[PDB]
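Example 3.2
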Amino acid sequence: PSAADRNVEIWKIKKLIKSLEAARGNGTSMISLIIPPKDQISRVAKMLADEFGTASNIKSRVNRLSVLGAITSVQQRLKLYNKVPPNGLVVYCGTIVTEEGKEKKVNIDFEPFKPINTSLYLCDNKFHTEALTALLSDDSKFGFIVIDGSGALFGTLQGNTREVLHKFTVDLPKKHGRGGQSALRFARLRMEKRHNYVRKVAETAVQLFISGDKVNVAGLVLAGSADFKTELSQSDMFDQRLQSKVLKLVDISYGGENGFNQAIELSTEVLSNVKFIQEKKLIGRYFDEISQDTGKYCFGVEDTLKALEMGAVEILIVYENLDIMRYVLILYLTPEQEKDKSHFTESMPLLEWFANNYKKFGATLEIVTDKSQEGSQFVKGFGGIGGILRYRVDFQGM
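Structure, written as C-alpha coordinates:
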Protein backbone atom coordinates (compact mmCIF):
# COMPACT_ATOMS: atom_id res chain seq x y z
CA PRO A 1 0.00 0.00 0.00
CA SER A 2 0.93 3.80 -0.34
CA ALA A 3 -0.66 6.74 -2.20
CA ALA A 4 1.72 9.16 -3.96
CA ASP A 5 3.68 5.99 -4.66
CA ARG A 6 0.47 4.72 -6.19
CA ASN A 7 0.27 7.80 -8.40
CA VAL A 8 3.75 7.36 -9.76
CA GLU A 9 2.56 3.99 -11.00
CA ILE A 10 -0.41 5.55 -12.82
CA TRP A 11 2.00 8.04 -14.48
CA LYS A 12 4.04 5.23 -15.96
CA ILE A 13 0.95 3.50 -17.29
CA LYS A 14 -0.19 6.62 -19.15
CA LYS A 15 3.36 7.10 -20.41
CA LEU A 16 3.39 3.45 -21.64
CA ILE A 17 -0.11 3.64 -23.09
CA LYS A 18 1.09 6.68 -25.06
CA SER A 19 4.10 5.09 -26.73
CA LEU A 20 2.14 1.81 -27.26
CA GLU A 21 -0.59 3.46 -29.30
CA ALA A 22 1.93 5.51 -31.29
CA ALA A 23 3.14 2.26 -32.91
CA ARG A 24 2.00 0.28 -35.96
CA GLY A 25 4.40 -2.01 -37.94
CA ASN A 26 3.69 -4.39 -40.84
CA GLY A 27 1.12 -7.14 -40.33
CA THR A 28 0.33 -9.86 -37.74
CA SER A 29 3.46 -9.09 -35.75
CA MET A 30 1.93 -7.29 -32.87
CA ILE A 31 1.29 -9.31 -29.73
CA SER A 32 -0.86 -8.10 -26.86
CA LEU A 33 -0.85 -10.59 -24.03
CA ILE A 34 -2.85 -9.89 -20.93
CA ILE A 35 -3.14 -12.62 -18.34
CA PRO A 36 -5.68 -12.35 -15.53
CA PRO A 37 -4.72 -13.25 -11.91
CA LYS A 38 -4.90 -16.88 -10.79
CA ASP A 39 -5.34 -18.02 -14.40
CA GLN A 40 -2.49 -20.38 -15.32
CA ILE A 41 0.72 -19.64 -17.20
CA SER A 42 1.23 -23.07 -18.79
CA ARG A 43 -2.23 -22.72 -20.26
CA VAL A 44 -0.74 -19.72 -22.04
CA ALA A 45 2.61 -21.33 -22.80
CA LYS A 46 0.80 -24.12 -24.68
CA MET A 47 -1.47 -21.84 -26.68
CA LEU A 48 1.81 -19.99 -27.66
CA ALA A 49 3.47 -23.29 -28.59
CA ASP A 50 0.36 -24.16 -30.58
CA GLU A 51 0.24 -20.85 -32.35
CA PHE A 52 3.99 -21.21 -33.12
CA GLY A 53 3.50 -24.70 -34.57
CA THR A 54 0.66 -23.44 -36.79
CA ALA A 55 2.71 -20.44 -37.93
CA SER A 56 5.61 -22.76 -38.77
CA ASN A 57 3.57 -23.86 -41.77
CA ILE A 58 2.86 -20.37 -43.16
CA LYS A 59 5.77 -20.64 -45.60
CA SER A 60 6.20 -17.07 -46.94
CA ARG A 61 9.52 -16.43 -45.29
CA VAL A 62 8.78 -12.81 -44.62
CA ASN A 63 5.30 -13.51 -43.21
CA ARG A 64 6.50 -16.72 -41.54
CA LEU A 65 9.59 -15.12 -39.88
CA SER A 66 7.32 -12.28 -38.79
CA VAL A 67 4.86 -14.34 -36.83
CA LEU A 68 7.49 -16.75 -35.51
CA GLY A 69 9.59 -13.95 -34.03
CA ALA A 70 6.70 -12.33 -32.30
CA ILE A 71 5.64 -15.59 -30.61
CA THR A 72 9.17 -16.45 -29.81
CA SER A 73 9.56 -13.00 -28.31
CA VAL A 74 6.64 -13.26 -25.88
CA GLN A 75 7.51 -16.92 -24.91
CA GLN A 76 10.90 -15.68 -23.98
CA ARG A 77 9.41 -13.12 -21.59
CA LEU A 78 6.84 -15.49 -20.18
CA LYS A 79 9.58 -17.92 -19.10
CA LEU A 80 10.78 -15.33 -16.61
CA TYR A 81 7.57 -15.53 -14.67
CA ASN A 82 7.08 -18.68 -12.51
CA LYS A 83 3.34 -17.92 -12.24
CA VAL A 84 0.91 -15.08 -12.58
CA PRO A 85 1.66 -12.61 -9.86
CA PRO A 86 -1.24 -10.90 -8.12
CA ASN A 87 -3.10 -8.30 -10.20
CA GLY A 88 -1.88 -10.37 -13.17
CA LEU A 89 0.44 -10.02 -16.17
CA VAL A 90 0.60 -7.63 -19.16
CA VAL A 91 2.87 -8.33 -22.09
CA TYR A 92 3.59 -6.50 -25.33
CA CYS A 93 5.89 -7.83 -27.99
CA GLY A 94 6.53 -7.15 -31.57
CA THR A 95 8.34 -5.48 -34.40
CA ILE A 96 7.57 -1.96 -35.46
CA VAL A 97 8.81 0.61 -38.00
CA THR A 98 10.60 3.44 -36.23
CA GLU A 99 12.29 6.66 -37.29
CA GLU A 100 14.45 6.38 -40.45
CA GLY A 101 12.18 3.53 -41.51
CA LYS A 102 14.32 1.17 -39.33
CA GLU A 103 12.93 -1.73 -37.28
CA LYS A 104 12.48 -1.49 -33.59
CA LYS A 105 11.61 -4.49 -31.41
CA VAL A 106 9.31 -3.97 -28.44
CA ASN A 107 9.58 -6.21 -25.32
CA ILE A 108 7.28 -5.33 -22.41
CA ASP A 109 6.23 -7.62 -19.55
CA PHE A 110 5.08 -6.49 -16.12
CA GLU A 111 2.53 -6.65 -13.26
CA PRO A 112 -0.03 -3.77 -12.89
CA PHE A 113 -2.71 -3.33 -10.15
CA LYS A 114 -5.73 -5.43 -11.29
CA PRO A 115 -6.88 -6.44 -14.81
CA ILE A 116 -8.98 -9.50 -13.97
CA ASN A 117 -10.51 -11.95 -16.48
CA THR A 118 -9.47 -9.62 -19.29
CA SER A 119 -7.41 -12.56 -20.48
CA LEU A 120 -6.20 -11.13 -23.77
CA TYR A 121 -4.44 -12.63 -26.72
CA LEU A 122 -4.37 -10.66 -29.94
CA CYS A 123 -2.05 -10.59 -32.90
CA ASP A 124 -2.77 -7.46 -35.03
CA ASN A 125 -0.99 -4.50 -36.73
CA LYS A 126 -1.49 -2.52 -33.46
CA PHE A 127 -1.04 -3.00 -29.76
CA HIS A 128 -4.30 -3.25 -27.79
CA THR A 129 -4.35 -0.95 -24.74
CA GLU A 130 -8.07 -0.57 -23.83
CA ALA A 131 -7.16 -2.83 -20.98
CA LEU A 132 -4.57 -0.40 -19.70
CA THR A 133 -6.55 2.85 -20.09
CA ALA A 134 -9.28 1.17 -18.00
CA LEU A 135 -6.93 1.01 -15.03
CA LEU A 136 -7.26 4.75 -15.60
CA SER A 137 -10.81 4.73 -14.09
CA ASP A 138 -9.47 5.63 -10.66
CA ASP A 139 -12.19 7.94 -9.34
CA SER A 140 -11.75 8.64 -5.63
CA LYS A 141 -14.85 7.53 -3.72
CA PHE A 142 -16.07 9.60 -0.77
CA GLY A 143 -18.11 8.79 2.32
CA PHE A 144 -21.21 10.74 3.36
CA ILE A 145 -23.00 10.70 6.77
CA VAL A 146 -25.82 13.22 7.03
CA ILE A 147 -27.29 13.48 10.55
CA ASP A 148 -30.47 15.29 11.49
CA GLY A 149 -33.03 15.64 14.26
CA SER A 150 -35.57 13.44 12.51
CA GLY A 151 -33.31 10.81 10.90
CA ALA A 152 -29.85 9.91 9.59
CA LEU A 153 -28.44 8.93 6.17
CA PHE A 154 -25.33 7.34 4.63
CA GLY A 155 -24.23 7.38 1.01
CA THR A 156 -21.44 8.01 -1.43
CA LEU A 157 -20.29 10.45 -3.95
CA GLN A 158 -17.74 9.21 -6.45
CA GLY A 159 -17.16 11.25 -9.56
CA ASN A 160 -20.70 12.16 -10.55
CA THR A 161 -21.96 8.79 -9.29
CA ARG A 162 -24.41 9.47 -6.46
CA GLU A 163 -25.36 6.57 -4.17
CA VAL A 164 -27.78 6.41 -1.25
CA LEU A 165 -26.83 3.45 0.84
CA HIS A 166 -28.79 3.12 4.09
CA LYS A 167 -31.25 5.38 5.90
CA PHE A 168 -32.87 4.84 9.32
CA THR A 169 -34.56 7.26 11.69
CA VAL A 170 -35.28 8.34 15.24
CA ASP A 171 -38.06 10.28 16.90
CA LEU A 172 -36.34 11.83 19.91
CA PRO A 173 -38.22 12.99 23.09
CA LYS A 174 -40.13 15.85 21.45
CA LYS A 175 -43.47 16.45 23.27
CA HIS A 176 -43.76 18.56 26.47
CA GLY A 177 -47.31 18.11 27.75
CA ARG A 178 -49.33 20.54 29.92
CA GLY A 179 -47.57 20.45 33.24
CA GLY A 180 -47.77 16.66 33.02
CA GLN A 181 -44.12 16.05 34.12
CA SER A 182 -40.90 17.78 35.26
CA ALA A 183 -38.55 19.90 33.20
CA LEU A 184 -35.38 18.09 34.32
CA ARG A 185 -37.13 14.76 33.91
CA PHE A 186 -37.47 15.85 30.20
CA ALA A 187 -34.10 17.28 29.55
CA ARG A 188 -32.81 14.13 31.23
CA LEU A 189 -34.54 11.74 28.85
CA ARG A 190 -33.37 14.28 26.28
CA MET A 191 -29.56 14.14 26.61
CA GLU A 192 -30.15 10.39 26.72
CA LYS A 193 -31.86 9.51 23.45
CA ARG A 194 -29.43 11.76 21.61
CA HIS A 195 -26.51 9.73 22.95
CA ASN A 196 -28.58 6.73 21.70
CA TYR A 197 -28.45 8.35 18.25
CA VAL A 198 -24.93 9.74 18.55
CA ARG A 199 -24.32 5.97 18.72
CA LYS A 200 -26.70 4.01 16.47
CA VAL A 201 -25.58 6.43 13.79
CA ALA A 202 -21.84 6.48 14.58
CA GLU A 203 -22.30 2.72 14.67
CA THR A 204 -24.31 2.11 11.50
CA ALA A 205 -21.51 4.00 9.68
CA VAL A 206 -18.50 1.99 10.96
CA GLN A 207 -20.55 -1.08 9.90
CA LEU A 208 -20.66 0.59 6.52
CA PHE A 209 -17.88 2.92 5.34
CA ILE A 210 -15.10 0.98 7.08
CA SER A 211 -15.66 -2.37 5.37
CA GLY A 212 -12.74 -4.82 5.62
CA ASP A 213 -10.60 -3.53 8.54
CA LYS A 214 -10.14 -0.29 6.58
CA VAL A 215 -12.35 2.57 5.41
CA ASN A 216 -13.57 1.59 1.91
CA VAL A 217 -13.55 5.33 1.09
CA ALA A 218 -11.06 8.17 0.82
CA GLY A 219 -12.78 11.21 2.35
CA LEU A 220 -15.88 11.05 4.55
CA VAL A 221 -18.03 14.16 4.94
CA LEU A 222 -20.29 14.60 7.98
CA ALA A 223 -23.19 16.94 7.30
CA GLY A 224 -26.14 18.16 9.41
CA SER A 225 -26.85 21.03 11.87
CA ALA A 226 -26.24 22.47 15.36
CA ASP A 227 -23.35 20.20 16.50
CA PHE A 228 -25.54 17.10 15.97
CA LYS A 229 -22.36 16.10 14.12
CA THR A 230 -19.69 18.00 16.01
CA GLU A 231 -20.73 15.74 18.91
CA LEU A 232 -19.89 12.91 16.53
CA SER A 233 -16.42 13.72 15.25
CA GLN A 234 -14.70 14.58 18.56
CA SER A 235 -16.52 11.69 20.21
CA ASP A 236 -15.51 8.23 21.52
CA MET A 237 -18.35 6.06 20.22
CA PHE A 238 -17.37 6.90 16.62
CA ASP A 239 -13.68 7.70 15.88
CA GLN A 240 -11.08 4.97 15.36
CA ARG A 241 -9.50 5.68 11.97
CA LEU A 242 -12.82 7.15 10.79
CA GLN A 243 -12.40 10.31 12.83
CA SER A 244 -9.00 10.41 11.17
CA LYS A 245 -10.26 11.06 7.64
CA VAL A 246 -13.26 13.39 8.18
CA LEU A 247 -12.72 15.86 5.37
CA LYS A 248 -15.51 18.46 5.72
CA LEU A 249 -18.02 19.36 8.45
CA VAL A 250 -20.81 20.83 6.39
CA ASP A 251 -23.79 22.70 7.75
CA ILE A 252 -26.98 22.13 5.80
CA SER A 253 -30.55 23.18 6.53
CA TYR A 254 -32.93 20.22 6.58
CA GLY A 255 -31.15 16.96 6.17
CA GLY A 256 -31.73 13.39 5.11
CA GLU A 257 -31.63 12.79 1.32
CA ASN A 258 -32.65 16.33 0.51
CA GLY A 259 -29.69 17.65 2.48
CA PHE A 260 -27.60 14.94 0.90
CA ASN A 261 -27.58 16.84 -2.36
CA GLN A 262 -27.02 20.04 -0.49
CA ALA A 263 -24.06 18.24 1.23
CA ILE A 264 -22.73 17.03 -2.13
CA GLU A 265 -23.22 20.36 -3.94
CA LEU A 266 -21.27 22.15 -1.19
CA SER A 267 -18.52 19.51 -0.84
CA THR A 268 -17.60 19.61 -4.56
CA GLU A 269 -14.22 21.43 -4.98
CA VAL A 270 -12.64 19.99 -1.96
CA LEU A 271 -13.33 16.57 -3.60
CA SER A 272 -13.04 17.69 -7.20
CA ASN A 273 -9.73 19.30 -6.53
CA VAL A 274 -8.19 16.87 -3.96
CA LYS A 275 -4.98 16.24 -5.97
CA PHE A 276 -4.47 19.94 -6.76
CA ILE A 277 -5.01 20.53 -3.02
CA GLN A 278 -2.38 18.14 -1.77
CA GLU A 279 -0.23 19.19 -4.71
CA LYS A 280 -0.45 22.91 -3.72
CA LYS A 281 0.16 21.90 -0.09
CA LEU A 282 3.17 19.94 -0.98
CA ILE A 283 4.78 22.63 -3.06
CA GLY A 284 3.87 25.20 -0.47
CA ARG A 285 5.70 23.32 2.25
CA TYR A 286 8.60 23.22 -0.16
CA PHE A 287 8.51 26.99 -0.76
CA ASP A 288 8.45 27.23 3.04
CA GLU A 289 11.97 25.73 3.45
CA ILE A 290 13.25 28.16 0.90
CA SER A 291 11.66 30.85 3.02
CA GLN A 292 12.74 30.01 6.66
CA ASP A 293 16.37 29.69 7.86
CA THR A 294 15.83 25.95 8.45
CA GLY A 295 16.31 25.74 4.70
CA LYS A 296 16.13 21.96 4.18
CA TYR A 297 15.60 22.35 0.48
CA CYS A 298 17.33 21.74 -2.86
CA PHE A 299 16.66 22.31 -6.52
CA GLY A 300 18.02 22.28 -10.06
CA VAL A 301 19.30 19.01 -11.60
CA GLU A 302 22.90 19.07 -10.42
CA ASP A 303 22.33 19.61 -6.69
CA THR A 304 19.21 17.50 -6.56
CA LEU A 305 20.90 14.50 -8.10
CA LYS A 306 23.86 15.40 -5.89
CA ALA A 307 21.68 15.62 -2.77
CA LEU A 308 19.76 12.58 -3.95
CA GLU A 309 22.96 10.61 -4.56
CA MET A 310 24.33 11.41 -1.12
CA GLY A 311 22.14 10.98 1.93
CA ALA A 312 18.39 10.78 2.30
CA VAL A 313 16.32 13.77 0.97
CA GLU A 314 12.68 13.15 2.08
CA ILE A 315 10.61 13.94 -0.99
CA LEU A 316 11.76 14.36 -4.55
CA ILE A 317 9.64 16.82 -6.41
CA VAL A 318 9.48 16.74 -10.16
CA TYR A 319 7.35 18.40 -12.86
CA GLU A 320 5.32 15.95 -15.09
CA ASN A 321 7.06 17.32 -18.18
CA LEU A 322 10.72 18.14 -17.91
CA ASP A 323 12.57 18.79 -21.07
CA ILE A 324 15.57 16.83 -19.73
CA MET A 325 17.17 13.72 -21.21
CA ARG A 326 19.58 11.34 -19.50
CA TYR A 327 22.04 9.34 -21.60
CA VAL A 328 25.02 7.04 -20.89
CA LEU A 329 25.05 4.41 -23.67
CA ILE A 330 26.01 9.88 -17.51
CA LEU A 331 24.84 13.28 -18.78
CA TYR A 332 21.68 15.27 -18.06
CA LEU A 333 20.92 17.66 -20.85
CA THR A 334 17.89 19.65 -22.01
CA PRO A 335 17.09 19.72 -25.68
CA GLU A 336 20.30 21.80 -25.80
CA GLN A 337 21.40 18.26 -26.74
CA GLU A 338 22.00 19.48 -30.34
CA LYS A 339 25.69 20.25 -29.70
CA ASP A 340 29.24 18.85 -29.43
CA LYS A 341 28.32 15.52 -27.84
CA SER A 342 31.80 14.09 -28.63
CA HIS A 343 30.49 10.55 -29.47
CA PHE A 344 29.82 7.34 -27.49
CA THR A 345 31.84 5.93 -24.55
CA GLU A 346 19.77 4.27 -22.41
CA SER A 347 18.83 7.77 -23.66
CA MET A 348 15.95 7.71 -21.14
CA PRO A 349 14.07 10.91 -20.22
CA LEU A 350 15.11 11.96 -16.72
CA LEU A 351 11.75 11.60 -15.01
CA GLU A 352 11.37 8.26 -16.68
CA TRP A 353 14.56 7.29 -14.84
CA PHE A 354 13.56 8.74 -11.48
CA ALA A 355 10.40 6.57 -11.42
CA ASN A 356 11.93 3.15 -12.07
CA ASN A 357 14.51 3.52 -9.33
CA TYR A 358 13.64 6.09 -6.65
CA LYS A 359 12.31 3.43 -4.28
CA LYS A 360 16.04 3.07 -3.46
CA PHE A 361 17.17 6.54 -2.32
CA GLY A 362 14.96 7.33 0.65
CA ALA A 363 11.50 7.00 -1.03
CA THR A 364 8.62 9.33 -2.07
CA LEU A 365 8.45 10.71 -5.59
CA GLU A 366 5.96 13.49 -6.30
CA ILE A 367 5.24 14.34 -9.93
CA VAL A 368 3.46 17.69 -9.95
CA THR A 369 1.96 19.93 -12.59
CA ASP A 370 1.97 23.56 -13.42
CA LYS A 371 -1.79 23.75 -13.01
CA SER A 372 -1.30 26.08 -10.06
CA GLN A 373 0.67 29.12 -9.01
CA GLU A 374 2.70 26.78 -6.85
CA GLY A 375 3.58 24.31 -9.66
CA SER A 376 3.90 27.00 -12.26
CA GLN A 377 6.45 28.82 -10.05
CA PHE A 378 8.12 25.55 -9.12
CA VAL A 379 8.76 25.16 -12.83
CA LYS A 380 9.14 28.62 -14.24
CA GLY A 381 11.21 29.52 -11.21
CA PHE A 382 13.31 26.57 -10.13
CA GLY A 383 13.39 24.29 -13.15
CA GLY A 384 10.68 21.99 -11.81
CA ILE A 385 13.03 19.59 -10.04
CA GLY A 386 14.00 20.02 -6.41
CA GLY A 387 13.59 18.29 -3.11
CA ILE A 388 12.67 18.59 0.55
CA LEU A 389 15.84 17.50 2.33
CA ARG A 390 16.08 16.06 5.86
CA TYR A 391 19.08 18.09 7.07
CA ARG A 392 20.80 21.12 5.60
CA VAL A 393 23.36 20.51 2.90
CA ASP A 394 25.85 22.94 1.48
CA PHE A 395 25.98 23.49 -2.26
CA GLN A 396 28.86 25.63 -3.52
CA GLY A 397 29.44 27.28 -6.89
CA MET A 398 27.91 26.08 -10.18
